[PDB]
Each structure stands twice: as C-alpha cells, then as structure tokens.
Homo-oligomer: A and B are copies of this chain.
Amino acid sequence: EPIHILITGAAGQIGYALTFRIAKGDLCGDRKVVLHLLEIPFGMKALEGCVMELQDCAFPNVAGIVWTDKVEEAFKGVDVAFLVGSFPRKDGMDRSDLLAKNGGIFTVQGKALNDYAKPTVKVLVVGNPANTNCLIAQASAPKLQNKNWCAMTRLDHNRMVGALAAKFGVTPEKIHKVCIWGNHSNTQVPDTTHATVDTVKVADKLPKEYLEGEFAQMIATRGGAVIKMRGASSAASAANAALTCVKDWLYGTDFVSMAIPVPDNEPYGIKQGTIFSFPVTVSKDGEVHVVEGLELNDWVKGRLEATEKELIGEKETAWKVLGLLEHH
C-alpha cells in the first residue's frame, strides 16, 4: 500500500525541493511513500548526500527509498513519475540540438515507464521542453494510454493566481478560474477572461490592455525574471507547482492548467497530436476533464494558433532529429 513515487534529476535544485515535500507527506497525505530517486552518474555522489539528508529529516511518512542511476530500478512499480531531469539548453545549441539530446533521454524513460512502471502510472514532465519531451516519452510507450501523461504548466498557472492575488490585495485562495493554454513556455497563453476574485470577474475589473498585454508579458517572462534575481532556477515554486499539479491530478479539484495529450474531441479546434495545456477540472477518481465550453476572444484564439503552431513545429523537429517515420 505505500505509494512509489519517482523523481528524475533528483539531486538537482528542483528535484531536491520536491523530494522532501513528497517525503513529508505533502502529496499523498497520510499515505506512506516509497521515494524513487534517479540521477545520472555525475549526480550519484550528490544524490547519495541528498539521501543522507532524507534520513536526517526523520520523516515517518517515508516507507522506503530507491536511489539509483539504473532506470529499470528507478522506474519499477512506480505510481507517479516526476520527469524533472533533462538535457539543459546550452550556448551554441539549436532547438534541434536540444530536441536531439532530450529525445534520447525521454525515449528511454518513456519506454522505461512502459516496461517497468505500473500501467496506471501518472507522468508529469517538467524538464524542458516539457510538452515535446512528454510527447517523446508517450510515443515510446505502446502499452500506456494518454491519461498517463502530463506536462507541467502549473507554475505559470500559480504565477497568475499569485500575481492577481497581489493586484486585488486578496489572499491567493480567492482567485479562481485562471489557466495557461498551449506550450509550457515561449507561447503559453495567460488567460484571464474567465477569472474571478472574492465576487467580481477579474476580466471586467482590470483593463484588457493590461491583462492581455503587460500582465501576459509578465507571466511569459516570470521564469527568467526570477532566475535573474536569484541567480538560480525557480526551484521551490516549481517544485510546488509540480506537487500541486499531481496533487489535483490524483485527488481532484474552479479549474487548473494541465498540458495533456489532446483528446479525440479536440476541444477549441486544437488539433490532436501534441501535448497541449488546457483549463481542466479533475474528478475525485483522478480523471482529467478539459473545460470545453468557454468564450474565447480574438486575443485568446490568436494566441492558441501561435502556441499550437509552435508545438506542431517543435514535434516535427523532434521527429527530424530522431530519424522517425510516419508510423512512429
């Protein structure tokens, strides 16, 4: 009965921030966890040190610890996978250079999940490019359906809640119905046209130029802004984003943002074949449902074409440098 939860790139800043929250029992309440920790050989020494810290925390909620560089051992029997680790974008690197390196990582992990993980596993891809990476993993796992998969857009989601909370001078508990559409970055759509605040609708309380201009642009650049100030990745906020994304994913929910494989229904004319972020509700059985009947203005719609265009374009590059054919 204890739940097996995997974190890749576990000795890094994001993984390190997430391990201890999960281990404390923040993700699964009073249910004991068997924490799975994966690192590349360069990180095994640091991972070991992280594991030492975990013991030094003395969490009763921790049933066990699997820490390894072997993916069969790391991915075996897990119910939740936080695919945090990835190949970081470096200087002089094309997107196709990025997609090539991450493609190899996530085709391996996609199949690792498929063979070793539970058929009922929930995979949250965090490593960039999340959406396209998640698509690589999904395409490597023939046994797994698409309910198993999700890329994270919850950080930009909470960045919206937090920012709107502070604008209205209200606690974040009283901002509802925000969402991110599309890709996790570059073209993510900060949609504030359904949002409310404790209760008047955010839309007819703040200017359209603000919400769909300055505000939107702040969301898009928030990640880099934090990095510039701290000189480090948005570790704690992201780890919180991923934890709560999976929290709701497991136990239900207004609505939240999740980058999921586009359903056969193809809501809002978003073409199937990419990992696309939607405003979604989640049932208490952990079933994700896209919020289907919304009024999108010419800004939101035009922003959707921009982000889907990027997703489809990026996946086309992934197939290109992965040497893939139609039936792949």
A contact residues vs B (CB 8 Å cutoff): 11, 16-17, 19-20, 24, 26, 45-46, 48-50, 52-60, 62-63, 155, 158-159, 161-163, 165-166, 171-173, 175, 222, 225-232, 234-237, 240-241
Contact = CB atoms under 8 A, between A and B. Distances in A.
Given A11-B230, A50-B230, A53-B234, 10 more contacts: A46-B229, A49-B225, A49-B228, A52-B222, A53-B236, A57-B158, A57-B237, A58-B162, A60-B171, A63-B171
A235 B19 CA distance: 13
A71 to B, nearest CB: 22
Complex A-B, nearest 10 residue pairs according to Cβ-Cβ distance, in ascending order:
A49-B229, A49-B230, A60-B173, A56-B237, A58-B172, A55-B162, A53-B237, A58-B158, A58-B161, A58-B162
A48 B225 CA distance: 10
A225 B52 contact: yes
Contacts of A225: 49, 52
Nearest to A225: B52
Q: Please state the number of chain copies in the assembly.
A: 2
A56 B159 contact: yes
A116 B86 CA distance: 48
Contacts of A240: 20, 57
A84 to B, nearest CB: 16
A46 B230 contact: yes
Chain A residues touching B, majority SS: helix
Contacts of A231: 46, 49
Contact of A229 (B19, B26, B45, B234): B45
A162 B57 contact: yes
Contact of A56 (B16, B58, B162, B227): B162
A59 B244 CA distance: 11
A318 to B, nearest CB: 29
